[PDB]
Design a binder for these strands. Structure first.
Ligand SMILES: [Ca+2]
Ligand SMILES: [Ca+2]
Length: 290
DNA sequence: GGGTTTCCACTTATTCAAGTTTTTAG
DNA sequence: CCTAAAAACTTGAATAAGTGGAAACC
């Protein structure tokens, strides 16, 4: 195939990517711990194709199943991490994950110098892991009773190719059949993301010249939606972005279906029985209906 | 060698994606 | 009346993040 666009790749990595650092107890390591560093992406078997395109683009990474319904692309070959670092130095992440990427660079530096085989090297990898993703494990915390200070990432959307990658991961295209003819057809575009990235989400309103932001939460967990319902905004500002900047994954299929329906709203055909039928058949075979 | 690296099978907590309603704007 | 648009919510699983186990390279 062809190279995945560098900016779509970072956009997909902001959404679905993950950086990893394993500090494991090992009775056979000079320092009692062995380490593994890398970057990984896990998807439904559905989108194995994405993983395989990212692999031939980077010429690194190993693909294996993850449970019965998922598939992962992991990169931990030390030398192959140079490729991941050459990418994100050129096409930096945008979300708070850039923080996890920076603590990923510092660990790579520790391991490039081979320090992680000496006592003080593992201590530094522990200070770093404390701030990366979910931080230290309890077994590991009680083993290392550390330093911190992680900066908040506050960047803006660099270009549209980034949005396509992010949306391919976090995007959502929905046809809302609203009761009451008694069935209003309303298109909906959604981006969902943890409240940790309030500032990025709010920039979608100005960046896309439409939409609105609301917060929901289940128990202690909160998140934000970016929602677009105005048809003219969807037909003129949202749809043209992703025609220009193609999406990846089966979600690409969902969008194309969304657009089929969009062209019916435009032609006013959804106000007729025969047209509302075709809209109903299109909703059936998209999203979880696919 | 054999410590260390790299890989393959697998698990889990929640952040997502997706869906369900009812109200408000025009 | 007549839709369009917005408000507000819930929910399960595809994520992200992590873990077990070991062949075997260097
Ligand atoms: Ca995400
Ligand atoms: Ca996704």
């Amino acid at each position: 195939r062809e190279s995945i666009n560098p900016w779509i790749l970072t956009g997909f990595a902001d959404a679905e990517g993950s950086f990893l650092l394993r500090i494991r107890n090992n009775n056979k390591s000079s320092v009692g711990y062995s380490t593994e560093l890398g970057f990984q992406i896990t998807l439904h078997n559905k989108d194995k194709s994405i993983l395989e395109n990212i692999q031939s683009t980077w010429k690194v990474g190993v693909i294996a199943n993850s449970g019965d319904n998922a598939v992962s692309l992991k990169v931990t070959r030390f030398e192959d991490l140079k490729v991941i670092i050459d990418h994100f130095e050129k096409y930096p992440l945008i979300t708070q994950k850039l923080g996890d990427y920076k603590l990923f660079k510092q660990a790579f530096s520790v391991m490039e110098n081979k320090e992680h085989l000496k006592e003080n090297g593992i201590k530094e990898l522990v200070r770093i892991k404390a701030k990366l993703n979910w931080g230290l494990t309890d077994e590991l915390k009680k083993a290392f009773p550390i330093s911190k200070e992680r900066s908040l990432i506050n960047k803006n959307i660099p270009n549209f190719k980034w949005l396509a990658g992010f949306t391919s991961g976090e995007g959502h295209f929905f046809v809302n059949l609203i009761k009451s003819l008694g069935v209003q057809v309303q298109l909906r575009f959604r981006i969902t993301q943890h409240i940790k990235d309030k500032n990025l989400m709010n920039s979608l309103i100005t960046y896309l010249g439409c939409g609105y932001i609301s917060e929901s939460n289940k128990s202690e967990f909160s998140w934000l939606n970016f929602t677009v319902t105005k048809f003219s905004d969807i037909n003129d500002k949202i749809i043209p972005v992703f025609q220009e900047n193609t999406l990846i994954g089966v979600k690409l299929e969902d969008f194309e279906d969304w657009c089929k329906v969009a062209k019916l709203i435009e032609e006013k055909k959804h106000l007729t029985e025969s047209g509302l039928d075709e809209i109903k058949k299109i909703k059936l075979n998209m999203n979880k209906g696919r």
